[PDB]
Coordinates of C-alpha atoms and ligand atoms in Angstrom, one line a residue:
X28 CA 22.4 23.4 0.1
X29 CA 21.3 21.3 3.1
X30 CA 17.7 20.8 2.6
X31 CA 16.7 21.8 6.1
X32 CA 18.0 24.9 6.0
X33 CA 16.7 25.9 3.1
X34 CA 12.9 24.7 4.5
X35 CA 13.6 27.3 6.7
X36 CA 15.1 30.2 4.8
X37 CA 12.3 29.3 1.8
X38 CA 9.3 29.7 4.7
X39 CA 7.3 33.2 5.1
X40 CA 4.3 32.1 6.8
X41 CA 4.7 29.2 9.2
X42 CA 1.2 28.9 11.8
X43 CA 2.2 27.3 15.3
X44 CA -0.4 26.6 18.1
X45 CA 1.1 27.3 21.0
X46 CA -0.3 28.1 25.1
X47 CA -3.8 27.6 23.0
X48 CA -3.1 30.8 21.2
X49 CA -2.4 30.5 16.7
X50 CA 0.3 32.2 15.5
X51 CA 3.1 32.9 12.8
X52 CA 6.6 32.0 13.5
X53 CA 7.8 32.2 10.1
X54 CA 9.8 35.6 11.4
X55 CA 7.5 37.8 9.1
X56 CA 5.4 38.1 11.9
X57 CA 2.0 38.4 9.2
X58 CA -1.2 39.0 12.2
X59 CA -3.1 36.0 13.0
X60 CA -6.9 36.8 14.1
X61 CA -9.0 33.9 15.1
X62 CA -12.9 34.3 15.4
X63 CA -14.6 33.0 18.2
X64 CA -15.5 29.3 16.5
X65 CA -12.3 28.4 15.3
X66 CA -12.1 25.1 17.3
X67 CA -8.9 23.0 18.7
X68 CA -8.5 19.8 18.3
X69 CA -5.9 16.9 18.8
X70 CA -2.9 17.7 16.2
X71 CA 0.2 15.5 14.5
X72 CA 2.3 17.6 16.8
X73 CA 0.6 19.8 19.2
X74 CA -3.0 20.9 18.8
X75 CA -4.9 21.8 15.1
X76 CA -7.2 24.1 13.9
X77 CA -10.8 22.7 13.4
X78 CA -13.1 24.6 11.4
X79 CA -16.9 24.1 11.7
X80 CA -19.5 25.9 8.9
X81 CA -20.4 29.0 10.5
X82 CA -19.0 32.5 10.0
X83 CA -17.4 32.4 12.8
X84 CA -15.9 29.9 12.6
X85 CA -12.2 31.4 11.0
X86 CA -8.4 32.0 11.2
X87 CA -7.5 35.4 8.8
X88 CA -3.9 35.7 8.1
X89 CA -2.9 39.1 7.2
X90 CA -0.3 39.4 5.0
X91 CA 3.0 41.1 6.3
X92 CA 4.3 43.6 3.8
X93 CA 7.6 41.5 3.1
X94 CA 5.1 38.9 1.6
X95 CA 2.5 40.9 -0.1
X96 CA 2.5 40.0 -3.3
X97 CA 5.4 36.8 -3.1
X98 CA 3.0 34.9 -5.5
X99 CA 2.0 37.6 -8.1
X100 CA 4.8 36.1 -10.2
X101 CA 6.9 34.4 -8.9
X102 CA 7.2 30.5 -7.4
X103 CA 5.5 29.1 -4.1
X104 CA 4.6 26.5 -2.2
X105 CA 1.6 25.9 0.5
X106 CA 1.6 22.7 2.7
X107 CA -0.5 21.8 5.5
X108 CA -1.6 18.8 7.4
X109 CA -5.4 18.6 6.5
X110 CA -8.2 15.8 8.2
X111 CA -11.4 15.8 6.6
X112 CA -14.4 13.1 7.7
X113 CA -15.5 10.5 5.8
X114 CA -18.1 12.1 3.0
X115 CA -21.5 9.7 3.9
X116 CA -23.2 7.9 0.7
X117 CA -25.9 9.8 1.3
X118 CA -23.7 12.7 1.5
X119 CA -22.1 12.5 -1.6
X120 CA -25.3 12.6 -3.5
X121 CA -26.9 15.6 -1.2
X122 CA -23.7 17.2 -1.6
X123 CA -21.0 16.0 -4.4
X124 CA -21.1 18.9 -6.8
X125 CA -21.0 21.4 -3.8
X126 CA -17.5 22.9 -4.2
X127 CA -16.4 24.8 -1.4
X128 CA -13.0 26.5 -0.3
X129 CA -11.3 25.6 3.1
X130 CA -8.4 27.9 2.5
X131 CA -8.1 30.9 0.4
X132 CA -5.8 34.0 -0.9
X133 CA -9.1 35.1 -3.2
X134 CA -10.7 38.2 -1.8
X135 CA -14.2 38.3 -3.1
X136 CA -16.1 41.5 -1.2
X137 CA -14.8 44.1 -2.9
X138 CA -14.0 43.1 -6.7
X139 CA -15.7 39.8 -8.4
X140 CA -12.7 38.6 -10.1
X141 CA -11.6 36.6 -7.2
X142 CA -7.9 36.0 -8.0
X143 CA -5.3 34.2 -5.9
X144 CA -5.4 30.4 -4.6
X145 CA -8.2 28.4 -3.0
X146 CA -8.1 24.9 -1.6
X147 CA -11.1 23.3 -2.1
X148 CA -13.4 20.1 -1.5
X149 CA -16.2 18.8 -3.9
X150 CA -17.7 15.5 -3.0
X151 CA -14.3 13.0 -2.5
X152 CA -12.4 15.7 -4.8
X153 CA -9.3 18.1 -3.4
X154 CA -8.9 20.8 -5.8
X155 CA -6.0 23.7 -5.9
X156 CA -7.2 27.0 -7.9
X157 CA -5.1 29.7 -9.3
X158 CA -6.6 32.6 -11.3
X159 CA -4.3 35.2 -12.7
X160 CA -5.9 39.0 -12.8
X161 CA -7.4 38.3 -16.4
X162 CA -9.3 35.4 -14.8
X163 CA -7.1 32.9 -16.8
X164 CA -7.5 29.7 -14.6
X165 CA -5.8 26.8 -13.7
X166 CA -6.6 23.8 -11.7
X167 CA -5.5 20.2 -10.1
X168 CA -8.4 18.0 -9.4
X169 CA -7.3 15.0 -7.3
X170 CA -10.0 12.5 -7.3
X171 CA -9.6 10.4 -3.5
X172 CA -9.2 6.8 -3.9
X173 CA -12.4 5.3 -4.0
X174 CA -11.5 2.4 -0.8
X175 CA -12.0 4.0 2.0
X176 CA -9.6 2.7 4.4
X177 CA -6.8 3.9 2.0
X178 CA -8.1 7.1 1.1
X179 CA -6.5 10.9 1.8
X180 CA -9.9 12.2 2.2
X181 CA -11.3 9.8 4.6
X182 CA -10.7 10.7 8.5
X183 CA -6.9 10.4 8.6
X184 CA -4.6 13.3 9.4
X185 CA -2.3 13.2 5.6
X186 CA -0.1 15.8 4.8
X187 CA -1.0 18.0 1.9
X188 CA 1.8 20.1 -0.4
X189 CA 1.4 22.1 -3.3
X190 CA 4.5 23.8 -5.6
X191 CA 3.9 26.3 -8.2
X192 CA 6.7 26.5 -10.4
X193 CA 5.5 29.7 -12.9
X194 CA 7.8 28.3 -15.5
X195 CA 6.0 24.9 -15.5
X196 CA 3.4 22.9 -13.5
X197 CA 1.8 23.4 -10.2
X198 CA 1.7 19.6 -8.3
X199 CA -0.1 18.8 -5.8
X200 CA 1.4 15.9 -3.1
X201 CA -0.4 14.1 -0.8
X202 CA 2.1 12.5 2.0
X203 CA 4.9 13.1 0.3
X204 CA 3.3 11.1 -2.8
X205 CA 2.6 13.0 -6.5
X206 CA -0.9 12.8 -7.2
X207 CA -1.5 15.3 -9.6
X208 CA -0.6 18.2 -11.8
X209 CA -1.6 21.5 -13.9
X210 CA 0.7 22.8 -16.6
X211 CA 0.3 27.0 -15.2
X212 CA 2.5 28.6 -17.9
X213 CA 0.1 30.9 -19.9
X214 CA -1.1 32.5 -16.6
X215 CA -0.3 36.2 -16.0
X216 CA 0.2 38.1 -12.5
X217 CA -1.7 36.9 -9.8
X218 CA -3.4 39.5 -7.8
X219 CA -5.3 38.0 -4.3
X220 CA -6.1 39.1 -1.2
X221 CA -4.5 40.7 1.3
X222 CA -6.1 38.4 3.5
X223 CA -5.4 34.3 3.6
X224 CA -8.4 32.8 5.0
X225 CA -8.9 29.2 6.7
X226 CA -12.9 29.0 6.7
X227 CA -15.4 26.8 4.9
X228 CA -16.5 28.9 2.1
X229 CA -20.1 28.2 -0.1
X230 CA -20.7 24.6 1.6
X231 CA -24.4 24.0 2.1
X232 CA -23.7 21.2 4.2
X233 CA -24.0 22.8 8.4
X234 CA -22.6 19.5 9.7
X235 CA -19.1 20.2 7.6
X236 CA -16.2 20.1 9.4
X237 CA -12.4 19.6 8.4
X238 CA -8.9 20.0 10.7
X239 CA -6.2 21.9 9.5
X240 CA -2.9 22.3 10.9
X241 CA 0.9 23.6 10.3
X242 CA -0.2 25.8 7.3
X243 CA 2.5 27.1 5.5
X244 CA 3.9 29.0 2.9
X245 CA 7.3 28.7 1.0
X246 CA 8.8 30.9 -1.5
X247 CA 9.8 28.2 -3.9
X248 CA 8.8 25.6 -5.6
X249 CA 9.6 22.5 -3.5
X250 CA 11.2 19.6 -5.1
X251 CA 10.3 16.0 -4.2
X252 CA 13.5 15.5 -1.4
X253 CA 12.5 18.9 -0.1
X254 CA 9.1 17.6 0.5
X255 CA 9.9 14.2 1.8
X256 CA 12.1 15.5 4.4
X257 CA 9.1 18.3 5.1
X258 CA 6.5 15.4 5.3
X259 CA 8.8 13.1 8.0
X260 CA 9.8 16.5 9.9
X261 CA 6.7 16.2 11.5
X262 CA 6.4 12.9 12.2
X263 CA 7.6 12.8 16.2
X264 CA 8.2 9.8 17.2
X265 CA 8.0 9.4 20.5
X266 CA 4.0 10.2 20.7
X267 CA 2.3 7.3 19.5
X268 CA -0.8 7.4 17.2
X269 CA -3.9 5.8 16.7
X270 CA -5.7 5.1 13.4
X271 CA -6.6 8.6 12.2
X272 CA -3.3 9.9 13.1
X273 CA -4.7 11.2 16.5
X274 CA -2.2 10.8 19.7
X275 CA -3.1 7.2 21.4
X276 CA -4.4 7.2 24.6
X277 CA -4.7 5.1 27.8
X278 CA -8.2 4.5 29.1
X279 CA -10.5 4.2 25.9
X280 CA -11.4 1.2 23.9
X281 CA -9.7 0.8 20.6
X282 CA -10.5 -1.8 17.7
X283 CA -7.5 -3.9 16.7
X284 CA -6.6 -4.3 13.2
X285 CA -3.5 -6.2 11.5
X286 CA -1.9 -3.6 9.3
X287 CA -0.1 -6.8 7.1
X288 CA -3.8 -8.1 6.8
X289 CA -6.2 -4.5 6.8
X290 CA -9.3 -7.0 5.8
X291 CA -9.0 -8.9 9.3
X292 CA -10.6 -8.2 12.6
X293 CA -10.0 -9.2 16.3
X294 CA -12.2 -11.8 17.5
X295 CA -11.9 -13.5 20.8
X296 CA -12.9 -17.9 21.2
X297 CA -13.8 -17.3 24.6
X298 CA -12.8 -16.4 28.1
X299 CA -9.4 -17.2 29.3
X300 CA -8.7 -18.9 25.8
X301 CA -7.1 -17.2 22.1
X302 CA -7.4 -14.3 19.9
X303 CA -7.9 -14.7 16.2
X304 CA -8.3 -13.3 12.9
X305 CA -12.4 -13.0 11.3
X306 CA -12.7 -11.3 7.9
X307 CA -14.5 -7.9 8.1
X308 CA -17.9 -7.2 6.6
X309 CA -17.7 -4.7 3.7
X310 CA -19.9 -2.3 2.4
X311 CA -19.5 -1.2 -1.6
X312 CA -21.6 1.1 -3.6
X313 CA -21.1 0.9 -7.2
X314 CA -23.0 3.9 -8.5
X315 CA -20.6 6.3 -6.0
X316 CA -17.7 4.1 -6.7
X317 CA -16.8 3.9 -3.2
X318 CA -16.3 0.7 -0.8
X319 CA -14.2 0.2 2.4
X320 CA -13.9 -2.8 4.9
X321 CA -16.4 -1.4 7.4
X322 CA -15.1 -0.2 10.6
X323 CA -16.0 -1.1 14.4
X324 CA -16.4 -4.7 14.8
X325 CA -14.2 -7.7 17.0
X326 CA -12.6 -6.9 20.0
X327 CA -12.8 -4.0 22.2
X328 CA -9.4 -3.1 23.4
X329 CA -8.2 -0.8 26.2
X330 CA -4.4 0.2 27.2
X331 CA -3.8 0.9 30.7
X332 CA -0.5 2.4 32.2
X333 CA 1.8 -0.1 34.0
X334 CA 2.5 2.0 36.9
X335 CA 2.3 5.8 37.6
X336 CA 5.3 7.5 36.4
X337 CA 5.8 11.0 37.5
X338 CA 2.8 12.8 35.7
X339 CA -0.3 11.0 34.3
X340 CA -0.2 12.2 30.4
X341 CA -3.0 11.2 28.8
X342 CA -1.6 10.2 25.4
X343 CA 0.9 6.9 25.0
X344 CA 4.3 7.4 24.6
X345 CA 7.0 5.0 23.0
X346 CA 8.4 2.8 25.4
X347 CA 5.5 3.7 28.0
X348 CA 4.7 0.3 29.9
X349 CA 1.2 -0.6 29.6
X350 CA -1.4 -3.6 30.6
X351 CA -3.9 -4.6 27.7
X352 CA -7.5 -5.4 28.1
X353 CA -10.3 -6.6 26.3
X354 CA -13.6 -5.0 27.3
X355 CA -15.8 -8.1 26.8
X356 CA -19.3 -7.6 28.3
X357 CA -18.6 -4.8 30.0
X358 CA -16.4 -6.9 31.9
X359 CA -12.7 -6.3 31.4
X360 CA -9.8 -8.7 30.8
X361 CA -6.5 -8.8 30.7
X362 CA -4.2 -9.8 27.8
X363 CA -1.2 -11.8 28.4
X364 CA 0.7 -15.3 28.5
X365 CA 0.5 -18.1 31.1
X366 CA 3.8 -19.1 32.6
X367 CA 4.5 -22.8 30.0
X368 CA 1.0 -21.8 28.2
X369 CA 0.4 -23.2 24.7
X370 CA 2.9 -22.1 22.0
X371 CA 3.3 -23.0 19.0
X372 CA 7.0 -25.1 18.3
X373 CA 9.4 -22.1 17.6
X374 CA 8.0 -20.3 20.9
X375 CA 5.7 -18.2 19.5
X376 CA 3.4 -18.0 22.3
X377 CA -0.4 -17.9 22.1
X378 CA -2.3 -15.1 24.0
X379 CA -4.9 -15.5 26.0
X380 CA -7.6 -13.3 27.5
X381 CA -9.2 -13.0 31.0
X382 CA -6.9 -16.4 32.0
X383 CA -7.2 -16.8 35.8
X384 CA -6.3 -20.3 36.5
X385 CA -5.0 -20.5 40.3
X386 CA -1.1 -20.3 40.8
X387 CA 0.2 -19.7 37.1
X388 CA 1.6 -16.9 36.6
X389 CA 0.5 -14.7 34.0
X390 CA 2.9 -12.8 32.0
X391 CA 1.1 -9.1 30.9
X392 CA 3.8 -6.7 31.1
X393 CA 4.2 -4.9 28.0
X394 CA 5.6 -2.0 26.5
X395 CA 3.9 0.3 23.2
X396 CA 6.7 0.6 21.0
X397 CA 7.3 2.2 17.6
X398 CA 9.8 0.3 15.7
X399 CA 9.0 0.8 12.0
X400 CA 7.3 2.5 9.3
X401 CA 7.5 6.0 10.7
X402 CA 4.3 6.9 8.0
X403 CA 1.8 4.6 8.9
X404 CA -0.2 5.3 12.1
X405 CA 0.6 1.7 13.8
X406 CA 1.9 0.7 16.8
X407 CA 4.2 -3.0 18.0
X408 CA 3.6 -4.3 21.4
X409 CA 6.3 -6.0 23.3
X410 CA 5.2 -8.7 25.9
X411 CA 7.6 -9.5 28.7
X412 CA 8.0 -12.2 31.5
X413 CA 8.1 -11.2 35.0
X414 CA 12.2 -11.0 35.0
X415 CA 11.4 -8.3 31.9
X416 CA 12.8 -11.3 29.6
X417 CA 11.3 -10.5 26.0
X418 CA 8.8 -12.9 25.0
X419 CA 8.3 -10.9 22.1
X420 CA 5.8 -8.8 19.9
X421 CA 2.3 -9.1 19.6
X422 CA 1.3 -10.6 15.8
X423 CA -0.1 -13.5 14.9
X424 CA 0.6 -17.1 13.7
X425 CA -1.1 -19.5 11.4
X426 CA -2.4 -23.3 12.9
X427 CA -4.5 -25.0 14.5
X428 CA -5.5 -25.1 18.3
X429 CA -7.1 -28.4 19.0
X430 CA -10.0 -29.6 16.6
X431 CA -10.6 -26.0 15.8
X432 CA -10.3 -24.6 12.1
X433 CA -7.2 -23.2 11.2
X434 CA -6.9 -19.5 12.2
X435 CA -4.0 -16.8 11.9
X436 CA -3.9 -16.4 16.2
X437 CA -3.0 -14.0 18.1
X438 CA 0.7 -14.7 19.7
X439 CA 3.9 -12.8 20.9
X440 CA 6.6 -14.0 19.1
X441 CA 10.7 -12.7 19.0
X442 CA 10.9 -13.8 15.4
X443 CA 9.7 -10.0 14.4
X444 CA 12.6 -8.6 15.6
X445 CA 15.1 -10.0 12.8
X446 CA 12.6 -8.5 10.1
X447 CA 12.1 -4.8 11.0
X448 CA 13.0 -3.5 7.4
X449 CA 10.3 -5.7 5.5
X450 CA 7.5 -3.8 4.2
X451 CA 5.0 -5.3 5.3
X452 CA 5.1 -6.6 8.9
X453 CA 2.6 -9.2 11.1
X454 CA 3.7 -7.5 14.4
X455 CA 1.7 -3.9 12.7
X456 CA -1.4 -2.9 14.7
X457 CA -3.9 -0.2 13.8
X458 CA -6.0 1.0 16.9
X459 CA -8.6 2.3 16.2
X460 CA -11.4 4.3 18.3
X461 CA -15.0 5.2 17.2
X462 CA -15.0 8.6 15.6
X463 CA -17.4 11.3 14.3
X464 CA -15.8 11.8 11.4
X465 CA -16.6 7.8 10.2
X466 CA -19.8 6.0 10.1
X467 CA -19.9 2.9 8.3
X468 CA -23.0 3.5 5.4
Ligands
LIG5 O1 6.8 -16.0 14.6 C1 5.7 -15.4 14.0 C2 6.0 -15.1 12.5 O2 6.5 -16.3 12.0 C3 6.9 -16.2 10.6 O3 7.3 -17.4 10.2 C4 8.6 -17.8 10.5 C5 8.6 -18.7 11.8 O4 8.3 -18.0 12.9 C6 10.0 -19.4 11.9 O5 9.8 -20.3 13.0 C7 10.3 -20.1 10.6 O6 11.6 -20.7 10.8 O7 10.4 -19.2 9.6 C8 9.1 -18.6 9.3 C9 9.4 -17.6 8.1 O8 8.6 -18.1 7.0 C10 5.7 -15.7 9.7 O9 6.0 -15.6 8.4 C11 5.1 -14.4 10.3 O10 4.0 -14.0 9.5 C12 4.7 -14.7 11.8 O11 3.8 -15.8 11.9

């Protein structure tokens, strides 16, 4: 009755990373053998499993007997967290009506009926298969969202769950979110595999890669509060994250982006002076219906830890103290306010970069804090004077410094702190670091 218990009694395949070794620690105890190529990568908690197209490059999960045939008739549910890069324009036309399988219950070496489940890809498409021993099929063909910097199939880590309910529908849930379904009554005993395989199967494109981590199996048919508490389950938050949903580290230059204003970049007026907000270029492409705010322009950002602590993680934690810099030049900066510095009249006060004027005191002591929105991969900043007095979190504020034109600047203001339930939030950063996996067309 309490819905984490039943998570728990309803797994019976449940893969853990763990001392850099894959596992199950459902309790089944089904064998997991990984082939020399099966890559790992930064997780949403711990390390994944990153597959690259080679034949080596596979996890095979062999079925316990307890589990055998669990989906032959009866219901089940599969979730993972799945990453998969950015599909290129040119891409999509080389390769948009290659469907290939990531994961798979479908054995296919022995007899060509090929029944079970398959997860698969095709262009900007995630498809879930089931084929009953007649070859009666059913399918769910989620078609991504075509802007890019919102879309499930576009370089984020998103959280993937499908239920099979034999009496009804199969759904398919991205991130706790419905986004499609297949009526599967009418189909018959399904008879896969021993074998569940993680592995790119019939892609012609070699430079295909995806990330898969926490697969699991349940032997239900989840119901949408059983899958919202799955979905948060994982979301730890005391790691902090960066824009893919990758851990956030010190030492490596991140581009800043509002999360209440996605369309707006960092830019910088000049040396020891403000922060403000520039619209980002786009790129569109009407024949692929596909268009996305491109990435990777403004400011170059850089965290840096406060003081040593005990042990030097790599990754940023909440509550870590941190120094920010702009990396301007090659040349880098710090972030921060001037002791009675420009502010706008309720004390919102402006930041200002690389400010060295000779005996002010410059305020730059902040912490990386996660205050809100536990699904979105954003962070808040909180600046502090030197007698750790807050002067507030890092957003912005719209006016006028000057003659210049009006501009939504960067400042550090308390007001944020009475409005942590909104939705939306000005205090919201995305950080955001180059990546393989997106290249703006
Ligand atoms: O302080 C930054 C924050 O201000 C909000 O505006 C507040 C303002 O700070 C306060 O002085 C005034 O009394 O109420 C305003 C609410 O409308 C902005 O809405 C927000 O986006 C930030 O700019």
């Amino acid at each position: 009755e309490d819905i984490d218990v039943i998570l728990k009694k309803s797994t019976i395949l449940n893969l853990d990373i763990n001392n850099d070794i894959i596992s199950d620690i459902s309790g089944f105890n089904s064998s997991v053998i990984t082939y020399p190529d099966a890559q790992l990568v930064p997780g949403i908690n711990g390390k994944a499993i990153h597959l690259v197209n080679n034949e080596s490059s596979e996890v095979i999960v062999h079925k316990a007997m307890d589990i055998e045939y669990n989906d032959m008739f009866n219901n089940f549910t599969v979730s993972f967290w799945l990453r998969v890069p950015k599909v290129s324009a040119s891409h999509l036309e080389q390769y948009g009506t290659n469907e290939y399988s990531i994961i798979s219950s479908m054995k296919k070496h022995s007899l060509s009926i090929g029944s079970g489940w398959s997860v698969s890809l095709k262009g900007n498409n995630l498809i879930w298969t089931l084929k009953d021993s007649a070859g009666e099929v059913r399918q769910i063909t989620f078609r991504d969202l075509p802007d890019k910097f919102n879309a499930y199939l576009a370089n984020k880590w998103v959280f993937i769950t499908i239920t099979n309910d034999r009496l009804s529908s199969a759904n398919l849930y991205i991130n706790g979110v419905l986004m499609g379904s297949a009526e599967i009554t009418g189909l018959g005993a399904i008879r896969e595999d021993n074998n569940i395989t993680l592995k790119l199967d019939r892609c012609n494109n070699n430079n295909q890669y995806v990330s898969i981590d926490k697969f699991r199996i349940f032997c239900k048919a989840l119901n949408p509060k059983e899958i919202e508490k799955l979905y948060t389950s994982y979301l730890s938050i005391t790691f902090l994250r960066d824009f893919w949903g990758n851990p956030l580290r010190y030492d490596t230059e991140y581009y800043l982006i509002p999360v209440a204003s996605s369309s707006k970049d960092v830019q910088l007026k000049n040396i020891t002076d403000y922060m403000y907000l520039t619209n980002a270029p786009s790129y569109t492409n009407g024949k692929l219906n596909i268009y996305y705010r491109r990435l990777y322009n403004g400011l170059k950002f850089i965290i840096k830890r406060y003081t040593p602590n005990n042990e030097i993680d790599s990754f940023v934690k909440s509550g870590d103290f941190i120094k920010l810099y702009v990396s301007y030049n090659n040349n880098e900066h710090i972030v921060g306010y001037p002791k009675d510095g420009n502010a706008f009249n309720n004390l919102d006060r402006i930041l200002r970069v690389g400010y060295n004027a000779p005996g002010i005191p410059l305020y730059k002591k902040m912490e990386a804090v996660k205050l809100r929105d536990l699904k979105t991969y954003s962070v808040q900043l909180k600046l502090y004077d030197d007698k750790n007095a807050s002067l507030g979190l890092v957003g912005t504020h719209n006016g006028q410094i000057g003659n210049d034109p009006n501009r939504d600047i960067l400042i550090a203001s308390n007001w944020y702190f009475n409005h942590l339930k909104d939705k939306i939030l000005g205090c919201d950063w995305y950080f955001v670091p180059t990546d393989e996996g997106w290249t703006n067309d």
